[PDB]
């Protein structure tokens, strides 16, 4: 790992868009940047979400992914299973952060990939983007070692402009964790103030919180949202909640990602009417933990085919 801390030249070309390729090679190293060029990074990053919408609106195809949790190396071999960026759509449903000992450099990473694709890619805000998770988990602790806190805060400030769904070909709601019994209509998305730290209840906090009934789809009332006891806060919701909003949105389901899958990802049960899977989980970080052992997976959507890409973990020395 070199003592190397790289510089904005050697990061960015004369016209400001940052060179990736070398960018990854160093960070693959363990390298770390100037802290001037990390800042410029995320701000600069930053300045593109802002003016992103707190629902975007996306066309096919796409490649959508999952949870990274700082599994640096592993978003490195998701790019390659997903398609280089240069000609290929992604867009994330959040938690690039905690757990992973490298969350800043998927952060540096990615926010400099949405520089230079600014309209290829997409970024979603999960729940860790957020002052009270990174604060609890290792992320903070990590920017102050490698960095410093003005990176953190810089960061904090930058996941605060995350936009928190994405309209996917007019088809699928792309969110972190699911829905809100605030949130009825695509509309309601769209009136939210996102800029800020999530609130702890709310419409903004169930977006990135909620999960589906541990037995979605053959539970046994017709409950429809319930405290999130495993959360702790916000909301389980189930089947005929989701196949309610669905209908009523005219959408053919939700993807998310938040819950943790062997597979890498999981369907759902499928809406009565559409015959199609109501949710879908996709989880992206492989042997999540050092210790789960499990798949990851990405999403691809394209030429209205529908696969998915479960992919492994990679190594170090
Ligand atoms: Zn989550």
Request: proline letters at 5%; aromatic letters at 12%.
């Amino acid at each position: 790992p070199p003592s190397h801390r790289l510089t904005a030249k050697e990061v960015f070309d004369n016209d400001g868009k940052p060179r990736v390729d070398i960018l990854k090679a160093h960070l693959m190293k363990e390298g770390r940047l100037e802290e001037s060029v990390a800042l410029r990074i995320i701000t600069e990053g930053a300045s593109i979400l802002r003016q992103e919408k707190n629902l975007l609106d996306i066309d096919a195809p796409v490649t959508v992914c999952g949870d990274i949790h700082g599994q640096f190396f592993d978003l490195m071999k998701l790019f390659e299973v997903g398609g280089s960026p240069a000609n290929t759509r992604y867009l994330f449903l959040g938690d690039y952060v905690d757990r992973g000992y490298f969350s800043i450099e998927c952060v540096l990473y990615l926010w400099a990939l949405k520089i230079l694709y600014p309209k290829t890619l997409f970024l979603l805000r999960g729940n860790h983007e957020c002052r009270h998770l990174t604060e609890y988990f290792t992320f903070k602790q990590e920017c102050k070692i490698k960095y410093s806190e003005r990176v953190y805060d810089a960061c904090m400030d930058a996941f605060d402009c995350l936009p928190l769904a994405a309209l996917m070909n007019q088809q699928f709601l792309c969110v972190h964790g699911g829905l809100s019994p605030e949130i009825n209509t695509l509309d309601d998305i769209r009136k939210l103030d996102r800029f800020k730290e999530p609130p702890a209840y709310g419409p903004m906090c169930d977006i990135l919180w909620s999960d589906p009934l541990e037995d979605f789809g053959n539970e046994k009332t017709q409950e429809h949202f319930t405290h999130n006891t495993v959360r702790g806060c916000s909301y389980f919701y189930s089947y005929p909640a989701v196949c309610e909003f669905l209908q009523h949105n005219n959408l053919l389901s939700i993807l998310r990602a938040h819950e943790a899958q062997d597979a890498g990802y999981r369907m759902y049960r499928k809406s009565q009417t559409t015959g199609f899977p109501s949710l879908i989980t996709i989880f992206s970080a492989p042997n999540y933990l050092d210790v789960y052992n499990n798949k990851a997976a990405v999403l691809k959507y394209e030429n209205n085919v529908m696969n998915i890409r479960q992919f492994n973990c990679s190594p170090h020395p």
